Design a protein around this ligand. Structure first.
Ligand SMILES: [Ca+2]
Ligand SMILES: [Ca+2]
Ligand SMILES: [Ca+2]
Ligand SMILES: [Ca+2]
Lengths: 344, 343, 343, 343
């Protein structure tokens, strides 16, 4: 088995396992877990923010941010293919009572003039626009990197209208590794940033939200309500400190593996665009195959390669710490074998 | 003052005023208002449905329909410029806890394959898609008529998947007058239809939802929750019975006046597309004007013509019973005057 | 028939029917209905508040008040048998996402020390308490009057904790007639008051909320979201102006008729307590009867008297404009015949 | 320092820490974490239910159960002092749009006849009662045990009305230990039970919900929505398996320590009722003391004992694994020195 379904599947390193076992813990409901308290201090420091909040998932990170940013009946501008809108169970509507206002982007980049256009006038008929969300990297387009200049302009548009900005930075360090832009400088154009520890950085559980002391307080109370108020969570935060402080640099290996994997897949004859591979994700089209995305997933699964389809004709391949160059090469040999068996 | 902001501004006819003063009434919360009961019987019968529910507004018509069709956390597929998404205060999210899934359409017509692609798989990350809403006529695109075939194909898609279909037919009679499709035939492809009395049909207050007995029963309890459970509302249903039975045919005059207004406006030189005017609405673009939409509205208001912006660069003109052909002609002179100033 | 189920069954007076007939109307979504505007102005003036908002029901009046007073997650303290909790479809939880905090009272009066104890401290486990609701008269206890001292003390607790007060004054004018306390004085200890036009004051549709202009502005937008933004609603407001200014003082008849009814019912042998009858409601117990509430209601209905059970063993009788002293004396004869048959 | 604020403060045993280091993990979003999978299997088996779901907190455990049990606008009967009502941030209203219906109890036991009268009839005005919640042990009354006969009679009432039952069993194993009722038999009277790993059973994080397969599937989707869908959560589940399988019996020591603590505190002269100490909690009154609860807490803190106020005259001490019999006696001598200073 070679698991290219997601970078979520990453397993803890031996150093994470030791640190978790011997974590200094307390009751986080009293703010007394010291390893939680230090993870949040580090995260706030790293993003140049006042405060930070550990959460058991990126989904909860994003939804406590929406709650702390909005009142009932607000509208939240977000990209039409973004995670908050497609893969968070409609939570923004049920939990926050807010409307998404989807804006089609280009590989994650919403046209700033479209964002401006989507902001609501004050009129009794209209929800109040109170939040613009930006995802970086943008998952559904293939781990694409949103330009810093795009985020900068959207921040400006938001400040000109008294609207908050949230960065869905589930994979923001990947974006940073690919662009050279430090995450402090990304975060300077947002009121809040959620980032995952449990994807490429290899922690077993959870994410962090960074922002103002005011917002984080409101998000901490939203977390209690949603059920993310844990006890001796320092057992998880120990791994998160390691993930945050020791696992960023090596994301470059994931990017190089993903680039090598795409380059070779095109040489075999698969419909991939190696020029589109910016971070740790490859998109493969089934249009020159006699199967669709789902049938190809089954052939791959049967041959020892796990991937997932993202539409009827597209599959997403994701590299991560538990996929070595040797793994990529053994996967390429499987892809090569099946290719004659799957083409049109 | 010539009012082209909306057909909502229609005032009741003297016949309506007399019927309201004489209405036989009861407490609608016990279902004992006979004028309410007769309007709902007439509305169900007109639309081919088992049952109907009077509501104080079209917005409440849409929102009790959504509540009755959905559970918390469902997604509703709707057109990206439809009234439910654009101009109903985010009620579907606040009141029903449901996620809108906007689909950009063409003149209100969502591509049915785009509707199919929007329906969610069974996956834990994904809400359940339980409703598709369609708007006819489509307001924001200029009172455009959604082709019946589009509604047919989307009703087909929904049924394959067990999804309910709501038609926001706030102006469905304008659509019927222009398309020839009887409202009963549109309604056959829907689980529920809301339509307004208080717009082109000149009633002072209210809309009706038509549908199945069970759904209407659920929608009535949603009405009670949202605050639409009134008492002797037969006073309003008396005007509504007249609106439904006596004011439909003269909608062709609003359409003729709208067409005349648009052809003449184009001749003056405004950015209008008369070939797009099929009902009672005209969209005028300001790309060839000194002013934007909001500056033109102010200039028009100054000159005694009331209009409304639908975007930064588009104004909406609406005709109705209280705009006569002479009103249109007088408004065209005003529109003529201000053209040399604003070009 | 004689209808003692509720005072909602009141029919418009001839004066009202005339007023509705020639109401001067406009589109209330533009704030252009001159009769709505006058009704709101008179309502604000009558209660000593900056502004007012007409709504199609008292339920909508309470729920837009709650929405405008609160944010998601807040707690609302309210009497454990109040209408907002018992008879408003759980709307406060669905619409505003707010937690009721029920506090048992004596005939509507929550002990202020229990109110103060129900207020949440600043802790992450706890909702913020943002609203206290007081109902006057109190429906479920039988039209009981909350003493002005109770309102004052609760108002004082509220101001010292930063909490708003809403009076559910659906029947506030019945309370004012019984206690002699003018409605402005009650309303001076609240941030908002909802009062009904469609019960004892005999309008066919509607209630009004009064309060500060900012709150009213918020509640108007909640009204739009809930479906209460109507068009030429001056037709209803015309009746509501007569209800507000001219129908209050004759409420004393309804109280005299209620107590006459209650004294004669006890004399006959029914389990009523006429000393408890302060406004237009009488509660009759079925303890000494062969039937329960629902059984008694069926027998009464079969004999021409409509009443309403309020528990398994309690029934409610409500007097109103359409039940004269003559109507009462007849109903008492039916109650006499029935007593022998059902004791 | 001696921490008597709560049993939530328990730290992982050495064994737990070893298992955490070497837990086999997988991605739980894919159902692929074998240690999670085994914990859920063990939990379902211990309670005699079809399925189980690990969650990051008991708060999430209760709220996903409420979500899976209810539709919007439903009503939930629960005890007026229960955790879901007082200390879960109003989540049932925001997340589920449901109203609580508080029924006061005696030490967590709602009178079954009071649960009867709290159920709603079918009427358009009323929410639908869909859930009854019982808390065992009952926290705010001081860890009292709800009699199994109270649970069986309420289950009986629930089955008679189509109503689901949820047991908030945060401290259910404390109840089983003090009562001799196996948790499997408690669980037989409920559709679902939530119980905490992270209080007295000493795991660092998390709770478990058990119920039927379809319920748990619905609650797993609610978990995803609320943000409790974690990845390699087997690290947490490794300690949870130890908590569930090896930490239950020694809860007897916390009960012994609590009784010993309380008995000796009374000998010293504090206002404690040792007979009321049924599990691991001691309630102490400030009636015979200079200070209120908040004063006494601060004085105990400066002296090296952490405790919590549960009211303005009541304080709560909680025994747990990390309080030895030595810790207890060191705390007793601190309570001695303070007594004259507050008597
Ligand atoms: Ca991971
Ligand atoms: Ca009208
Ligand atoms: Ca009436
Ligand atoms: Ca613990």
């Amino acid at each position: 088995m070679i698991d290219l379904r997601s970078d979520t599947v990453t397993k803890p390193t031996e150093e994470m396992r030791k640190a978790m076992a011997q974590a200094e813990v307390g009751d986080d409901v009293y703010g007394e877990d010291p390893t939680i308290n230090e993870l949040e201090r580090l995260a706030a420091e790293t993003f140049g923010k006042e405060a930070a909040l550990f959460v058991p998932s990126g989904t909860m990170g994003n939804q406590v941010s929406i709650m702390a940013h909005t009142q009932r009946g607000d509208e939240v501008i977000l990209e039409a293919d973004s995670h908050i809108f497609w893969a968070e169970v409609g939570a923004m509507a049920v939990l926050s009572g807010v409307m998404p206002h989807p804006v089609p982007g280009k590989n994650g980049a919403m046209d700033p003039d479209d964002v401006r256009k989507a902001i609501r006038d004050g009129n009794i008929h209209f929800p109040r626009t109170s939040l613009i969300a930006i995802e970086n990297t943008h998952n559904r387009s293939g781990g694409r990197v949103v330009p810093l200049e795009n985020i900068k302009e959207i921040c400006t548009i938001a400040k000109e209208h008294g609207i908050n900005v949230h960065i869905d930075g589930a994979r923001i360090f990947n974006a940073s590794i690919a662009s050279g832009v430090p995450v402090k400088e990304y975060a300077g154009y947002a009121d809040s940033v959620m980032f995952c520890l449990s994807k490429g950085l290899c922690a077993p559980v959870g994410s962090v939200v960074v922002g103002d002391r005011d917002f984080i307080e409101r998000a901490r109370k939203a977390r209690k309500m949603l059920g993310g108020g844990m006890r001796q969570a320092g057992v998880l935060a120990a791994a998160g400190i390691i993930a945050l402080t020791k696992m960023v640099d090596r994301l470059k290996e994931d990017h190089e593996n993903a680039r090598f994997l795409a380059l070779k897949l095109k040489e075999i004859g698969y419909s991939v665009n190696p020029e589109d591979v910016k971070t740790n994700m490859v998109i493969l089209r089934t249009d020159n195959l006699k199967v669709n995305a789902h049938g190809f997933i089954e052939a791959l699964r049967n041959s020892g390669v796990l991937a997932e389809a993202v539409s009827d004709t597209e599959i997403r391949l994701v590299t991560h710490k538990d996929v070595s160059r040797n793994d990529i090469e053994e996967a390429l040999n499987i892809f090569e074998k099946l290719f004659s068996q799957v083409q049109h």
